[PDB]
Amino acid sequence: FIVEDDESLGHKELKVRKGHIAKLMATEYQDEYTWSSLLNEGLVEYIDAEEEESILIAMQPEDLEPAEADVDPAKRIRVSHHATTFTHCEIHPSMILGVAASIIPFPDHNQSPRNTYQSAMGKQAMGVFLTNYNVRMDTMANILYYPQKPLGTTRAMEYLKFRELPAGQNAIVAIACYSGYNQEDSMIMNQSSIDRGLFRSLFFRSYMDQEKKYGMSITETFEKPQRTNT
Amino acid sequence: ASRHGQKGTIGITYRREDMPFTAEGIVPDLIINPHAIPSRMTVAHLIECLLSKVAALSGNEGDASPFTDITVEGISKLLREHGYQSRGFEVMYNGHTGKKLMAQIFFGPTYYQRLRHMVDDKIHARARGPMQVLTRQPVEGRSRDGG
């Protein structure tokens, strides 16, 4: 976003205002005024690493530049506005994450290595990878039986179409030392619940083969062989 | 694996009754050991479980986006309003005996993704099968009957 002054550097401001938001939403729901339009009107701006060296971004639109002005203790400790001459405001901080990281709920409460591990694992999860799997003929396809969208989502997962191609299920987990059969990681899974279909999955494997590659007369043929000096 | 870091494999399956059950008759389908948590400090795991519990009660979507203003206190308040212990603990009952447990149990839904490599692709045993050409030692790769 592009910070600006207005009647005052007070009351300095994002150029973009609720009117533009309205127009955007309208275009969104029309299913006329697209991001490119934001570009042309110069409310938003492309910034690269070099130019970044000479700007002053604000994290959150409002609180970072309302003015200089009782707090919920549970809320984290935000610093302040503390400065005036901003020039840009971040669109939304959660966008520093990549794709894989955007799956994680509350990744701001985790210890970073954990985030990295998840980012790696998420590419192993079974789940529907494409809506037409039954037509593709490729090696090694794994399809979940009854995927489910997660209950705890993040906004970004909407843009990854995740909640339409989810890659797991919501288990009723219980954290407990039950019979020591689940320590030093994992765990106990309800057998009956499995029978109900939990975490079932389909596996498809494709075998390819063709007739002779070579040999003018060496010509491999498909048929049912017998003891014909075979 | 959960959505944070907890790789894990199964390691026994109980029928329904044997699992602990709460007074409402709900019975988990997955028991993970508490010792996982503190060492790793995956608080977000707990928070997600809590939030998802609230969501499922109230029919919503758990907004777990990173840098929001959602706190634990708010989630807990909601959870209390639905009439549960405001931190997700639940009195549970031992499956074998039917007796209450002296300790209450953290309990809630949570998103778990099934990773690949089932074991049937790892189990492997060789008892004098085929050998290479060059060195006449056992061939390699379980797919190739390797040692």
């Binding site: 309208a26 906004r155 | 109230s58 919503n60 979507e61 708010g74």
Partner: peptide
């Protein structure tokens, strides 16, 4: 709080 998909009505009603 939770993620609300009823905001389509909000704008549609607000429009």
């Amino acid at each position: 709080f939770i993620k609300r998909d009823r905001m389509r009505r909000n704008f549609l009603r607000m429009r």
